[PDB]
């Protein structure tokens, strides 16, 4: 005989019925990097801890009027 | 053992007086191969804390 029932039962007791696979469709020829988590910085310290001030304020921009004839 | 086969016959060993198990028995399922694979599978099988021996 084949004893297909009983060799299924053999396979059951010896492996424990965890015996199939979830086959995944995979269609792309190329596999790519999964898109994952990307934080932004939370520094324990600032880089320089003091903002530099307005470099380019107006009183510093405008140096001079010209006083020439043209 | 109906998992392994529709049995030809089973018999169990009890005492005849105050009938309780003397811990053995016999079977035929149908086939020689069925008996072989059952024995091969369960020769040294453990359970609650007896273990069966089958031949």
């Amino acid at each position: 005989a084949p004893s297909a029932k009983a060799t299924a039962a053999k396979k059951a007791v010896v492996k424990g019925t965890n015996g199939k696979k979830a086959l995944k469709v995979r269609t792309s020829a190329t596999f790519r990097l999964p898109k994952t988590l990307k934080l932004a910085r939370a520094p324990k310290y600032a880089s320089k801890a003091v903002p530099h001030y307005n470099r380019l304020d107006s009183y510093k921009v405008i140096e001079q009027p010209i006083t020439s004839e043209t | 053992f109906a998992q392994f086969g529709d049995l030809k016959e089973v018999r169990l060993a009890r005492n005849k007086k105050t009938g309780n198990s003397r811990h053995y028995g016999f079977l035929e399922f149908v086939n020689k191969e069925d008996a072989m694979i059952a024995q091969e599978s369960m020769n040294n099988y453990l359970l609650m804390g007896h273990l069966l021996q089958v031949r």
Side-chain angles (χ1 to χ4, degrees):
Chain A
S3 290
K5 182 214 206 186
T7 194
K10 177 75 74 154
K11 210 77 187 162
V13 297
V14 75
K15 315 307 186 194
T17 74
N18 276 288
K20 307 294 288 188
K21 176 55 64 169
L23 77 179
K24 186 61 173 178
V25 67
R26 293 289 187 89
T27 178
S28 171
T30 313
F31 178 69
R32 298 286 284 264
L33 187 80
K35 312 312 203 309
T36 47
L37 180 51
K38 288 159 158 64
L39 289 301
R41 290 179 148 166
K44 310 312 203 208
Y45 48 82
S47 165
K48 57 185 76 178
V50 183
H52 212 279
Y53 60 92
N54 178 285
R55 293 177 217 284
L56 202 51
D57 76 288
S58 302
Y59 294 86
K60 198 200 88 172
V61 155
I62 280 154
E63 289 184 10
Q64 279 143 34
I66 296 298
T67 319
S68 90
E69 274 65 357
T70 190
Chain B
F1 288 88
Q3 299 165 119
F4 302 111
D6 53 348
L7 61 101
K8 289 159 152 166
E9 82 298 349
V10 57
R11 256 171 173 176
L12 184 141
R14 308 189 90 91
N15 187 40
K16 185 155 186 164
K17 285 69 56 164
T18 78
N20 43 351
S21 180
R22 301 172 166 172
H23 310 91
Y24 65 100
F26 291 79
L27 184 136
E28 292 163 353
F29 300 88
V30 293
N31 210 338
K32 296 181 186 147
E33 64 182 52
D34 298 359
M36 282 302 129
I37 64 183
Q39 190 264 304
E40 164 59 1
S41 38
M42 315 303 269
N43 173 229
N44 189 33
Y45 201 93
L46 173 62
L47 194 134
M48 260 299 289
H50 310 60
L51 76 175
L52 80 91
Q53 283 283 284
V54 52
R55 292 148 67 195

